[PDB]
Amino acid sequence: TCPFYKKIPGTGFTVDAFQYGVVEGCTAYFLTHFHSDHYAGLSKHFTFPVYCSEITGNLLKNKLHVQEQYIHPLPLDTECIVNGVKVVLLDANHCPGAVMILFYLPNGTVILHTGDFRADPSMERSLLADQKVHMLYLDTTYCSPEYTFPSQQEVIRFAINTAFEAVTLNPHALVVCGTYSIGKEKVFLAIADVLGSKVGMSQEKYKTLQCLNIPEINSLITTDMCSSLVHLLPMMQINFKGLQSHLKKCGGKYNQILAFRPTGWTHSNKFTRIADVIPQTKGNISIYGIPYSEHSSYLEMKRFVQWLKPQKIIPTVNVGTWKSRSTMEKYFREWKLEAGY
Ligand code: NI
Numbered sequence: 001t002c003p004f005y006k007k008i009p010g011t012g013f014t015v016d017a018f019q020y021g022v023v024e025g026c027t028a029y030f031l032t033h034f035h036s037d038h039y040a041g042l043s044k045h046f047t048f049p050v051y052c053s054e055i056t057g058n059l060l061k062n063k064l065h066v067q068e069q070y071i072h073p074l075p076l077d078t079e080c081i082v083n084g085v086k087v088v089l090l091d092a093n094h095c096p097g098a099v100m101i102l103f104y105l106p107n108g109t110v111i112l113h114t115g116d117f118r119a120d121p122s123m124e125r126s127l128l129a130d131q132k133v134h135m136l137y138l139d140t141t142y143c144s145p146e147y148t149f150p151s152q153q154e155v156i157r158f159a160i161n162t163a164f165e166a167v168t169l170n171p172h173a174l175v176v177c178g179t180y181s182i183g184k185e186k187v188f189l190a191i192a193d194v195l196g197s198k199v200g201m202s203q204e205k206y207k208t209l210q211c212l213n214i215p216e217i218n219s220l221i222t223t224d225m226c227s228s229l230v231h232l233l234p235m236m237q238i239n240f241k242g243l244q245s246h247l248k249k250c251g252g253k254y255n256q257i258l259a260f261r262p263t264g265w266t267h268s269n270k271f272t273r274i275a276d277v278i279p280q281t282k283g284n285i286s287i288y289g290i291p292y293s294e295h296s297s298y299l300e301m302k303r304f305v306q307w308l309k310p311q312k313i314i315p316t317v318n319v320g321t322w323k324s325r326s327t328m329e330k331y332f333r334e335w336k337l338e339a340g341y
Contacts, residue, residue, distance in 0.1 A: 005137065005314050008113075010105050011085055015113050015137070018042045028083050032115025033098035034059040034182055042066060051082060053089060055097030058211035059182075077127060090126055092117040094294045095183030096212045102127070112310070113137040119296040119304035128308065136310035140317045141295040143328050147265050148298070149291045150274045156190045158274050159260060159290060163191045166258045167229070173256040175230045176246065178238035182208060183294050184262045189220060191260070192230040200228030226253075235261065240282045247285075256284045262292040302335055309341040 006017040012027035018041030023029075031052040032038060042050070044065040049072055052060065057073035060066040074080050076089050076099070086104035094116045103111045112133045167173050175195070177188040192199045199221045201209075206223050214220070222228055233246065238261045247257055269291055279286040296304070305313070313332045318324040 005316055005319065008103055008111060010107060010109070011103065012083055013085075013103070015101065016115070018046075022048075030101055030113075031056055031060075032092070032101065032113070033095055034063075035095065035116065036181065038116075039064070046070060051087075053097045053099050055211065055213055056099075058213075059097065059208070062211055063208060088127055090123070090128070093120050093123075094118060095181070096185070096214070097182075109134045111135045111137065112308070114139045114316075116141075116294070117296060118294055119300040121303070123304065124307050133308055133310045135312050135314060136305065136308065137314045137316050138301075138305070139295065140301075140315040140328055142265060142293075142298055143301060143315070143318065143331060145298045146270065149265055149269050149293050152186065152292060154274055155290055155292045156186055158277065159187055159288075160190050160194045162288065163258065164194045166256075167195055170256055172254055173258055174247070174250065174254040176238070176243065176257055176259040177230065177232055178235040178259070178261045179205065179232050180235040182212070184292050185209070185212075185214070187260060187262050187290070187292055188230060188232055192220065192228075195229060197229045198222040198224075198227065199230045199232060200225040201232040205232055226251075229254075238287060240285055240287075243285050243287075257286070259285070259287045261287060261289045263289050264293050264295065265291060302331075305332075306335055306339040306341075309339070 002014060002017050002020045002023045006014050008015065012025055013030060014023055014026050015030045016032055016038040017023055017029060018039060028049050028051055031050055034056050042060065042064050044067065046066055047070060050060065050070055051072045051074060054073040057071045060071055061068060074089050076091060080087050085106065088102040089099040090102065092098040092100050092115050098115060100115055100117060101113045105111065110131060110133050114137065116139050163175050175191055177191065188199050201221065203223055206221060209217065209221055225231060238259055243257050243259055247254060266289065279288045315328050318328065
């Protein structure tokens with residue numbers, strides 16, 4: 001059964017609620033983004049209306065085979081009426097297609113659901129500038145001050161410079177990048193662009209990327225592994241065994257691998273600056289863990305919420321323990337006493 005923090009009071013709507021069967025009184029199911037924890041339950045057998053972005057809609061149709069008649073894509077930044085209620089979708093700065101949803105309730109209340117997001121100062125000049133929010137349903141993934149990490153731009157600068165140096169020193173090195181879901185595509189796209197290569201991958205992954213409305217994509221990716229010196233592999237293969245195994249398949253073209261494992265936050269962020277990051281190495285294989293996050297840092301979250309000044313906050317992540325819930329409520333009260341709302 002569907003938890004409270006996935007329901008929108010005074011509407012027939014739910015958000016990211018597909019794993020509970022038929023939800024009593026739900027006339028429209030919203031999907032914030034195409035990540036498995038959030039879509040859990042959708043398939044070709046689904047027969048209720050799904051509201052989402054264009055990109056999420058392309059993924060539902062081609063990857064999960066949801067029938068076209070039940071897919072309702074909405075443009076961003078545009079007032080839309082759904083089942084008699086005004087809604088707006090806003091870019092969440094998470095993975096491709098990910099949105100926040102603004103709901104203008106019939107009684108005058110205004111609710112923002114962030115989905116998953118990476119807060120940014122640019123969001124302070126969206127359609128949120130105008131107005132009051134009475135309830136914030138907040139992505140609290142990294143809601144504690146210990147969670148620090150660099151900007152995406154600094155992390156990509158590090159990856160580009162590391163890959164370009166290694167291949168210029170050795171033209172016979174291969175570069176490998178781990179993936180398991182959508183999101184973080186700048187990591188392998190930026191590396192391939194500096195090396196003058198297309199990105200090689202399986203047919204399954206190529207199909208997923210073809211759904212994402214990325215400009216000039218046909219010029220950037222391929223299923224012909226032999227033509228490419230940047231390869232994508234499932235994330236589970238990014239280890240010395242899996243990489244040795246991969247180098248055997250490449251027909252003596254290559255004598256070295258440099259691999260990247262994008263992660264979220266790890267505890268080595270508590271000590272090591274991005275500049276100072278070093279790899280794990282065995283023989284002719286080196287593996288870099290790089291902290292490329294698509295969720296808000298503590299400081300980014302705090303800034304956004306202090307700007308928005310919501311009357312009530314409902315967390316949607318880390319809700320399962322008394323200690324987590326208590327910790328988050330403590331920080332929401334500090335932020336409010338500090339800023340005066
Ligand atoms: Ni997500």
